[PDB]
Design an enzyme around this catalytic site. Structure first.
Site, PDB file in Angstrom:
ATOM      1  N   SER A   1       0.866  -1.177   0.000  1.00  0.00           N
ATOM      2  CA  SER A   1       0.000   0.000   0.000  1.00  0.00           C
ATOM      3  C   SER A   1       0.894   1.215   0.000  1.00  0.00           C
ATOM      4  CB  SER A   1      -0.854   0.062   1.277  1.00  0.00           C
ATOM      5  OG  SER A   1      -1.514   1.303   1.388  1.00  0.00           O
TER       6      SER A   1
ATOM      7  N   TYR B   1      -1.459  -0.796  10.268  1.00  0.00           N
ATOM      8  CA  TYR B   1      -1.418  -0.996   8.833  1.00  0.00           C
ATOM      9  C   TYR B   1      -0.066  -0.533   8.268  1.00  0.00           C
ATOM     10  CZ  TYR B   1      -3.477  -1.241   4.174  1.00  0.00           C
ATOM     11  OH  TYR B   1      -3.758  -1.561   2.868  1.00  0.00           O
TER      12      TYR B   1
END
Ligand code: NA
Ligand code: NA
Ligand code: NA
Ligand code: NA
Lengths: 242, 243, 242, 243
Positions: free
Chosen positions: D133, D146
């Site tokens: 990501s 995350y």
């Protein structure tokens, strides 16, 4: 006890770097395009010498280095700093004007490093290049500035690999540094919560010159702005179509 | 008193030097370390230096350490996350649980200590400094566990910086080869800066970063230029040998 | 069905890019400094047009774009590719020669993008810049090449931010691409175990032109070399003092 | 048959599209996914598509999944590590165990599946593709878990590449905003490419990377240019609002 040469020394970040080296006990010679402000800066400061000229001109760079050698007698530190902004492709910035931005921001740091090569090697000195976070992210219409700053970040590691171990060479990439009142939003939008000052940069310059195990590196000094992920509508940020 | 500083891995190497540097700066320091003997010795007859024996891999231990630190320091201004443990990786078929353990010491502990210290650091407008490695950015073979923890901590740095700004600034230093224990002529010459790094190279940068107020989210490489050297076999003095 | 212009098209990576676009059904106009090889390349290939000239000269860039418009009738893709290597500070490379490297490798991509700006916007086209892994790591004596390549990596994101959403702009940074027998060590030292070929680059060029959610990016195509951490004496690598 | 492909998170979003793309390319695909209903439906009446229900957070489950895949595929040529689970972080005081769980799905699973598949991938001169990501590189507030997993997987990518080269090439794709479930004019215009990403943007890049032989260790950003846009309040159409 060092001889220090600085470009763009008559204002803003360059000015504060000169002052910080004077305070550290060094002698400083700077070049700058604005004679009046620069002569004033140097006035009644016996260890601060000013040379008026445009770093865009290679012959001026040679004469500047000759002048600095005459005044300082030795060169231990070279600081490459060039603030001039410009437009870009949306303004259809002409080839010659793009080139000029490269002359000041990329050719000059190379040529001053080349002119000073032997002296810096002999003195086991330091080169510090001032770039910008615009090397790594862009706003529209920034092609000339982006190109010069990206080039100086790469030049930094090239010079470091050429001149190590004798000369260490590093780069600082400032974000928004106040060189001239701000809104609450102006300040709050920056993760560190303030606008940068020339002292944030000069403190890093002086610190890096004293290190001996950092070379080739670019350090971002932008209050965290480049690390903030921003999407429209999320975490207080919004995009407006005109 | 001046600042209250907590340091992990404080009993040896980089962590030890960071502790000493904060002491010299006038601060009070509490550190955790897995080796009781060396750490107790380090703290002995140094009244502003407090040792806590424990494994940062254990979350219960982390909570007890912060509680101990608050008792001894009464305030926390700086958190320094440092974890040196090397490991093997995929070529060694390093098992899941051992990979996890490296993540526990190198990635979970920094998060959890930041979380435990969150309100205190915010109140005191403090600093978090994470120690990673240039191994976050390039790899030698069989380095998966260490790479994963160090890549994680570099990203954790900007995450914490974005969460805790403007009150807490958070930065990371990525050391290269730091001598923490005689080197050949080639050993030193191969590094562009021409020397092996010392723990003072890192501690100097830690103390400097704690004093800056316009740097946050950043990782600074301190490796003598090694990661910036392009190397191809047979060129510019480097050679690859097939076993 | 695209009109594609390519610089450095008469040899090596540029040549393979031209071929790949011809194979995709496009018409291609390329500029190159070597008339003989370039005329031969274009000979008896009716959709391949050659323009002899030096991209270092801005007036030549304007005439090249005019020629391409006359032959292609539209410009959908611009590929900036400039291979010329150079020395640097250890060779005391003179200011003018450093500048020339910038003219070919950094000024030209800007100026061709500027000349083609409206046409690319109208055609919702693509710009692909070819850089080098030398933008990000250096061997000694590489200042000129490093500076141009670092500049083109930054120029890439600048152009992308200026010209999006209509034009997408990306960069490929090749490592060692064979453009001319290798030892077992030559090949084994590269993590991917081979030397690169122009097709590794051209495949990426054509792929990137077909994407619509990648812009501003530089992709490294170097068999993993830049990601290999190397210390003397460890994992099969050794440094020799002369 | 052609290639044997294993994909995690294959029952929805990006993973689903990657599965479909490999099927269309002529390969056999086995995927694991936490949602039995949607995944069983996806595999129904598609003979070359096999589903395994399980949580990648569990190491025992990972071993059983690879065993199942070998039974159904008989060979493994490509491993695609994809894990979408978002989480909170330090502002939410996300607890240790929940942070760990994100690491289990996002970082431990890719390592362990690479380890389980090591010899098979080496034999078949295969490929590993990791999905990260852009949150590995920049952060919004409250993203610690995350960020840590995604930063870890980007570093794991070059570690695996250096361990397994030249036989296995290993690369990572870092998506930005991919629509995996109507957007405003501002939503799309704010992205430099002027659109929201689709799962096909990512799957196209996965299939392309599997066919390259001179790219390894790399992370490619696929985010419409968002991470490259410099943004300051009040300039070039962006504004910050204080609550
Ligand atoms: Na004076
Ligand atoms: Na003590
Ligand atoms: Na022809
Ligand atoms: Na099926």
């Amino acid at each position: 006890n060092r001889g220090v040469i600085v470009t763009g020394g008559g204002h803003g970040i360059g000015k504060q770097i000169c002052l910080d080296f004077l305070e550290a006990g060094d002698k400083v010679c700077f070049i700058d395009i604005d004679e009046k402000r620069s002569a004033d800066f140097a006035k009644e400061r016996p260890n601060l010498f000013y040379f008026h000229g445009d770093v865009a001109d290679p012959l001026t760079l040679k004469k500047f280095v000759e002048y600095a050698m005459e005044k300082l007698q030795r060169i231990d530190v070279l600081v490459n700093n060039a603030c001039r902004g410009s437009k870009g492709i949306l303004s259809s910035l002409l080839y010659e004007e793009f080139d000029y931005i490269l002359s000041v921001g990329l050719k000059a740091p190379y040529e001053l490093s080349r002119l000073c090569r032997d002296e810096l090697i002999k003195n086991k000195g330091r080169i510090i290049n001032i770039a910008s976070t615009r090397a790594f992210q862009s706003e529209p219409d920034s092609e000339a500035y982006a190109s010069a700053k990206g080039g100086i970040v790469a030049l930094t590691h090239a010079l470091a690999m050429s001149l190590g171990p004798d000369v260490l060479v590093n780069c600082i990439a400032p974000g928004w540094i106040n060189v001239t009142e701000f809104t609450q939003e102006d300040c709050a939008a920056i993760p560190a919560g303030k606008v940068g000052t020339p002292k944030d940069i000069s403190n890093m310059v002086l610190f890096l010159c004293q290190q001996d195990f950092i070379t080739g590196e670019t350090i971002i000094v932008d209050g965290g702005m480049s690390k903030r992920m921003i999407y429209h509508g999320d975490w207080n940020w919004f995009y407006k179509i005109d």
